[PDB]
Design a protein around this ligand. Structure first.
Ligand SMILES: CN1CCN(Cc2ccc(NCc3ccc(F)c(F)c3)cc2)CC1
Ligand SMILES: CN1CCN(Cc2ccc(NCc3ccc(F)c(F)c3)cc2)CC1
Lengths: 282, 56, 177, 250, 250, 282, 56
């Protein structure tokens, strides 16, 4: 058993075109009735003479696995190594995929999803402008901590909570490759839900919409022990890349611009652009 | 325990893969599946309709 | 269009000249304003290349007593679009008869010099035009409305396909939500 | 149901959802010329698809006072697509035709039309012993009008309807291949006409193979409606066309 | 003897009693499109004989001071018989060609011509960074003149002969399919060019498939004779032509 | 199946030379006729006595695969980390192979090409000169984004478009190895075309030449979050390396110097250099 | 699933290769092919000509 040799998936090419000749009969493929809610299955071979053509095109790139299998920014934030405001020296982000527009719209084409997650972090630093900048500082180090719901939350950069004993964490040093991890399917339900037309309380009161099911936790980041004589600002970007994806119940893509990070609120928009008249084609 | 399979290429070629981690979530994306069936959304009717025959 | 819903209704009248144009449009499924936001157009805008045939289905939503015939033609790319029915009838077309079956399907064949076409279409990769003309005219008996409407449906055949994933341009933001 | 018919020639299709059967000439389907019947030596040209397709030939208006119309073939299609070009560039031609004449009206209209193809429909002048030019009997795809009263102008054909411009009883035209369009129970008539002539091939500019006639036997009638006329359309499609004797364009 | 050649396409024949072999593109004979390589869905049209025949494309005059000429195809045959009509009426086209260039002179004349077909012969403007219309490089069947001196007019292509209007050494054109007409031992050149392109089919009004060039490497010379010039004639014949995408005439 | 053992390609050596002796016959290999357009196939053995020689030379290095299998610069550009002009803080390059002369000339020896692409990016940074330079800045990070045709285009360094959800991107940090990726054959046609003797519009009007078929997209680069107190300039170089190459229809190499990046325009040039007279050989 | 093949060297030697990615475009250059045929450009004539025999 040194080699398994997985059988070929057998490239699935699109349907070919069969030769067709003149016809005169009672069959009427062209005529149908959309009232049934059934999309017609006619082909060009059924309405005009056609030659035989072998199609080698494939629909590989249109699979949901490939459609969603691209990393995308979902959040970015800034924190300073040293400053007067305690809250400004670290980040605290409740996890959610609704912050950035493109990735949100991509996901929102399906009602339910189920996938593994691959997370990558890009961190960069820069020296803040000022009157005196001459200083020497060794390489900086950063800590990323993930806090499942209900766990303790730090209140300052040097809090005791940063001594993770069960909470997973990553320590990263500048100059190396970006950090990365894999996250399994961690939903209490059988699938993630992008939409939820319901309330929180049983008497139809309280929070409404997909905000109710968002309980994925938080992410905290800080400089390990860097404390420069002069301020240094750092930025972190988070990238999500679904894997092993399955999707259900497609829905039409959104048309109106997003306006809230935890709601579907919008403003009415025209269906599409206009032209001179119904006959203009130039 | 290595897997050998073909790689995407018209009509004109093997790669080896090994898993190093004990959790299936760590595997690479399985983007080699191409099976599909659109009849679910295009022909959801109860009684099958022949294209040649009249709709009603 | 003061009322947005009017965009889905193609007017038709009882008395019209013998040969008259009902509508005309460019066949740019990913770029033309007509197909830009349709269920098909949205998918293409996530890609750069496309190929295959297309289906255009027309449904007559007039009265039951009304009758008529229509000519729907697809003209491959050329120096000038058709201006009269005599020009249109030369290219691919189908004569549509209105009866018990209220829907007719025009299959636009895939005629192109290249295996693929750009979504951001240009002069080089044009696709042609689609037009509809009165074949006989619409006739109605007494006590019926003098106007009717038609609707069009767009979809892809079983040989359609796309390539080169690209970020759509329809959606944008200026500040973090 | 046998009330629905569909015909597909070349890149054109005709669908009629309310029609009778399809008359087929004298029981003979169109076909190519056989080797043992030909006379010309050189290879023929057979541009099927390019020429074997439906061509709508303009439209007429049926009023309460209409008397009838006629077209002459193949001259009617003289300037219609590649068929016209091939006919111009060749000395000899040969082809059958499929004629489809549409006419639709509500359930409350009444009327009856006779559709008939008359081979070798020779016509006489309005004034006996007086010749006429080749313009009072065929000028392309435009239809020609019959007349209820006796014709008097000497430059055109005798248009007396009851004689059919042929010196024969109009009621006896049933002998030729024909169909009736009765508004009660019909909307179109289909006729398949094979190539009929005394020679294997003939020039299409000098010889009128056959004439198409539409005659209202029961005049149109209606009451209290906004529709003032019933349009009539004619569609033709050559079948198994082959040409020979390439020469400079006429 | 192998000095005599005869070619028969359609209803035309070419006989040369003093000629070399027949170069055949890149060793590929013209052929129809295969089912497994096509992309368009509808049935093509194949009007052989009607379009696959020889068409003489005007005549030029070879003087002692001639520098050369070029033609661009298929636009050169844009208005030549049914080929032009089919090209006008169709969106897509595909065809190979057989080029035959005749030039005869007595035993006492001397000279040498280069006949070459250059696929995708893109040309640059006379003035850098200046566009030109589609009239200084192809206007039907008329031949275009090269120039010995550098071109100066901004509305036409750079005609400097030694660069071939392509920015390449004129002496290196031998790489393309070609033949020499040497008055000592030759009278005509025959080239069979298959369909070369990056796609199965293309529009013939928007794309110049290939360019034909005739360049006198050794200038014509003679002495004490009544003949003042040597006419040159070019004949072309499409092979295995098929069209697709019927539309209204351009 | 632990080893496949690919069969040897069998080194193809050049033709040998066969021994030849004195001859006197009616055969005349030397005499031929170039009018046929056929290149003579004579060998030295056919015109003078020769010894037997075994040639072990091979033409391995002249294959098109090896001829084009070398990375070459195709574009370089500069962008500053901080500056007043927004357009000067990032790069936007429409992809094309006509910018740099050597690689252009190499490619232009064939009419049609079909290959995979290997892209490598070299990025370097330098501090701009100025009166005050004393500052401390952590390592910088860069982002490369590829935008297929028709996608949204950023208008400033901090635009929303930089949150790629479908557009592939690379995040790179200085001090590591250069970034790299592989790109498959992404032409709508069956092969890339270096030349195109045609127009854009069907009436022979509009753009002319190979500019019509160039629709490969754009590339954008920016500093992730670096914003120094003093300007820092960076340069990026792009290298292309074809793989699995096939070529068709060779054409003579160019002779006149290039003058435009999207045209064949040129100036007439002498065929070659001159010498004293036809007999001079010194 | 490993491939073993010879490596270029006069007349005086194996290397192993394994593919790690699922796309054929990621493979290394296949610069080991040496087949060639110049008759396409040097002898494009229709009738074969023997070198010994006269051209015409
Ligand atoms: C309501 N659902 C919530 C999930 N959302 C998709 C989603 C799911 C999980 C994530 N991230 C999971 C995760 C992955 C890695 C971590 F370190 C971590 F803390 C959390 C992001 C978006 C769709 C809407
Ligand atoms: C008109 N053709 C265009 C292609 N050109 C060759 C060519 C093809 C592709 C490329 N680059 C493809 C590419 C590769 C990687 C990328 F990230 C990217 F955005 C684009 C460069 C040159 C020959 C002339």
């Amino acid at each position: 058993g040194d080699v398994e040799e997985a059988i070929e998936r057998a490239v699935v090419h699109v349907a070919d075109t069969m030769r067709s000749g003149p016809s005169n009969s009672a069959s009427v493929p062209a005529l149908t009735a959309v009232e049934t809610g059934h999309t017609s299955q006619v082909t060009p071979s059924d309405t005009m003479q056609t030659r035989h053509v072998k199609n080698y095109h494939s629909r590989s790139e249109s699979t949901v696995e490939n459609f969603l299998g691209r990393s995308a920014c979902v959040y970015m934030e800034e924190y300073k190594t040293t400053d007067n405001d305690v809250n400004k020296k670290f980040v605290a982000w409740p996890i959610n995929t609704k912050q950035m527009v493109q990735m949100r719209r991509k996901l929102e084409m399906f009602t339910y999803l189920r996938f593994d997650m691959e997370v990558t972090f890009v961190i960069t630093s820069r020296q803040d402008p000022g009157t005196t900048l001459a200083q020497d500082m060794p390489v900086l180090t950063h800590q990323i901590m993930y806090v499942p719901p209900g766990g303790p939350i730090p209140a300052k950069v040097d809090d005791y909570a940063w001594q993770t004993s069960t909470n997973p964490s990553i320590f990263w040093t500048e100059g190396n490759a970006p950090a990365r991890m894999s996250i399994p399917f961690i939903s209490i339900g059988n699938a993630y839900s992008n939409f939820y037309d319901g309330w929180s309380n049983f008497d139809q009161r309280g929070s409404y919409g997909y905000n109710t099911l968002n309980n994925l936790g938080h992410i905290y980041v800080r400089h390990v022990s860097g404390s420069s004589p002069h301020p240094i600002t750092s930025t972190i970007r988070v990238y999500f890349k679904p894997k092993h994806t399955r999707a259900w119940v497609p829905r039409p893509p959104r048309l109106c611009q997003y306006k809230k990070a935890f709601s579907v609120d919008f403003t009415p928009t025209p269906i599409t652009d206009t032209r001179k008249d119904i006959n203009t084609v130039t | 325990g290595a897997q050998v399979s073909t790689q995407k290429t018209a009509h004109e070629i093997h790669y080896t893969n090994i898993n190093y981690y004990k959790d299936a979530a760590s595997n690479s994306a399985n983007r080699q599946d191409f099976t599909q069936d659109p009849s679910k959304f295009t022909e959801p009717v109860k009684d099958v309709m022949i294209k040649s025959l009249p709709a009603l | 269009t003061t009322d947005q819903m009017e965009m889905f209704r193609i007017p038709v009248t009882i008395n019209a000249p013998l040969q008259q144009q009902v509508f005309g449009l460019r066949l740019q499924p990913g770029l033309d304003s007509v197909f830009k936001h349709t269920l098909l157009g949205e998918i293409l805008n996530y890609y750069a290349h496309w190929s295959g045939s297309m289906k255009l289905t027309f449904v007559f939503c007039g009265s039951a007593m009304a009758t008529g015939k229509f000519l729907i033609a697809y003209s491959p790319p050329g120096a000038n679009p058709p201006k009269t029915r005599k020009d249109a009838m030369l290219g691919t077309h189908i004569i549509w008869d209105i009866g018990l079956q209220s829907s007719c399907v025009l299959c636009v064949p895939w005629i192109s010099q290249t295996h693929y076409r750009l979504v951001q279409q240009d002069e080089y990769t044009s696709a042609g035009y689609v037009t509809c003309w009165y074949q006989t005219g619409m006739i109605v008996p007494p006590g019926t409305p003098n106007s009717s409407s038609i609707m069009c449906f767009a979809s892809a055949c079983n040989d359609f396909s796309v390539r080169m994933l690209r970020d759509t341009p329809f959606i944008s933001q200026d500040n973090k939500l | 149901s046998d009330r629905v018919r569909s015909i597909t020639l070349g890149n054109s299709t005709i669908t009629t959802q309310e029609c009778a059967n399809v008359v087929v000439g004298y029981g003979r389907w169109p076909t190519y010329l056989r080797d043992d019947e030909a006379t010309a030596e050189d290879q023929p040209t057979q541009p099927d698809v390019a020429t074997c397709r439906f061509y709508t030939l303009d439209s007429i208006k049926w009023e309460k006072g209409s008397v009838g119309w006629w077209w002459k073939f193949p001259e009617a299609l003289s300037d219609m697509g590649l068929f016209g070009q091939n006919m111009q560039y060749h000395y000899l031609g040969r082809a059958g035709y499929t004629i489809h004449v549409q006419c639709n009206a509500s359930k409350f209209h009444q009327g009856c039309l006779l559709v008939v193809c008359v081979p070798e429909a020779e016509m006489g002048g309005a004034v006996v012993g007086q010749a006429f030019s080749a313009t009072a009997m065929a000028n392309g795809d435009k239809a020609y009008e019959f007349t209820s009263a006796t014709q008097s102008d000497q430059t055109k054909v005798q248009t007396a309807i009851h004689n059919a411009g042929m010196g024969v009883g109009v009621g006896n035209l049933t002998i030729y291949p024909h169909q009736w369009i009765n508004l009660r129970t019909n909307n179109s008539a289909t006729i398949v006409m094979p190539y009929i002539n005394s020679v294997p091939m003939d020039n299409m500019f000098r010889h009128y193979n056959f004439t198409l006639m539409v005659i209202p036997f029961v005049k149109l009638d209606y009451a209290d409606t906004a529709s003032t006329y019933v349009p009539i359309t004619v569609t033709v499609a050559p079948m198994c066309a082959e040409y020979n004797g390439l020469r400079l364009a006429q």
